[PDB]
Design a protein around this ligand. Structure first.
Ligand code: IWD
Ligand code: IWD
Ligand code: ZN
Ligand code: ZN
Ligand code: ZN
Lengths: 258, 258
């Protein structure tokens, strides 16, 4: 009956409201994806319940055990009906779940503390003084792992063997590491997040260079779900009607602190 | 069964080679989409034949007869098996054909002569000295017709009724009009095309402002087609390897002349 929506606490997509302890259900949350879920639900005419993914992950398959974790796993094992989050559309995931056309276009980017003498991935790969890493679990880390491109593979060899770990548990942890490193740590992350952080106090970070790749976030459903076709059409209509642009402005720039 | 691929002569996607005279079949052509087609066909193990769409159109449904024209129509009526071209993923099209995930992300942009006192969509809609239009039977013309945004509607109420017609049956005709207008005509077109033209001699055009929207091009197949799922995974695979980026640079800037 009620559509179970799995999502992840990742600002500004989904965040706990200030007085969330005084609220119940969907009203406890706010964000880009909270607004998008309400809109998809209104347009497709269904009732839903937002639930935060238990393990706080996006979705990877463990080799050997072959088990899918994160939001992807919730869909694959039937714990949720749909995933509305900054979940990257990838080949390995499309083999086990369905994705709508992209509701957001992005690429891997470089975040630096202002003043850091780095302007590109080639720059990072060629030097050793400034450390760099990615979100430990996700498509960004997998991009570097699977890349046959020289600069990116060179970057991976270093990241995989770096001690202590250059990988981080959450975006917030990567941003704090960039902010506290005196420019000795650069962070590789999804471009839209890099832009978001660039508009947050203390306004000491910035995106440098072009994006390393091009991809998109999609709404996900279990293969052969009855919700799949409907939701894909909703994303296309919402995009055409300009809602996706408006939501980005609201959560990124209208709220900008710099 | 040899796959009939429908496409469109639009540079640098599909162009007849300089020496097409002594060549035959798929050999007469070169381009971004020619390379892409060979890639998909290689990775999915099928034989194909490139055919240029009969009416030279992208695809739109006649409001009276309800009949689909262009590349979309060839797929809908079963005249072709797959469409590999700069075809925009839209809602109305997704209702009658299948689209893979985008092989290229883009948006509507402004092309000016050079020296033209226009720096944005607002600028265009505030004046009448400079004429402006779009292509036809395309997603660009439709974007302005359906736009509820104050500025874009202001532009359409002018374009729609603008005599002499500011619309062009072909991209080449739009670019030619900008070039021979003495700066009195600005053209609204898709960003990747605008960027390509800016790198072509006489090097007298320029893209100004940011994109008015965000969309993507996808490889299209008729609904129910078994080639659809395969080709989608093929697009994701190719993009992930960095091939689409490789093909973008090759045809856009390695071959640039400015
Ligand atoms: N979108 C990713 C998760 N994810 C998120 C952020 I924000 C980032 O910087 N890198 C990632 O891999 C996925 O889907 O795994
Ligand atoms: N991609 C469009 C066609 N198309 C093409 C170009 I190049 C442009 O500038 N505008 C369009 O509508 C479609 O698929 O209709
Ligand atoms: Zn709505
Ligand atoms: Zn290949
Ligand atoms: Zn008619």
């Amino acid at each position: 009956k009620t559509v179970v929506v799995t999502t992840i606490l990742e600002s500004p997509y989904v965040m706990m409201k200030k007085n969330h302890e005084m609220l119940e259900g969907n009203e406890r949350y706010e964000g880009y994806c909270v607004d998008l879920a309400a809109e998809i639900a209104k347009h497709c005419g269904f009732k839903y319940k937002l639930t935060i993914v238990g393990d706080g992950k996006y979705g990877a398959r463990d080799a050997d055990t072959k088990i899918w974790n994160g939001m992807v796993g919730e869909l694959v094992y039937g714990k949720a009906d749909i995933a509305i989050a900054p979940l990257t559309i990838t080949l390995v995931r499309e083999e086990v779940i369905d994705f709508s056309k992209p509701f957001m276009s992005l690429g891997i980017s470089i975040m630096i503390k202002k003043g850091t003498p780095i302007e590109s991935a080639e720059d990072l790969s060629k030097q050793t003084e400034i450390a760099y890493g990615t979100l430990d679990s996700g498509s960004t880390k997998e991009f570097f792992r699977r890349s046959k491109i020289a600069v990116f593979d060179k970057m991976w060899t270093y990241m995989r063997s770096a001690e202590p770990s250059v990988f981080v548990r959450t975006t917030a942890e990567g941003v704090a590491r960039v902010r506290k490193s005196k420019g000795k740590y650069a962070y590789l992350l999804e471009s839209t997040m890099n832009e978001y952080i660039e508009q947050r106090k203390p306004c000491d970070t910035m995106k440098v260079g072009g994006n390393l790749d091009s991809k998109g976030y999609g709404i996900a459903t279990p293969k052969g779900s009855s919700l799949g076709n409907a939701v894909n059409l909703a994303v296309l209509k919402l995009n055409e009607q300009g809602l996706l642009d408006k939501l980005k402005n609201k959560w990124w720039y209208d709220k900008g602190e710099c």
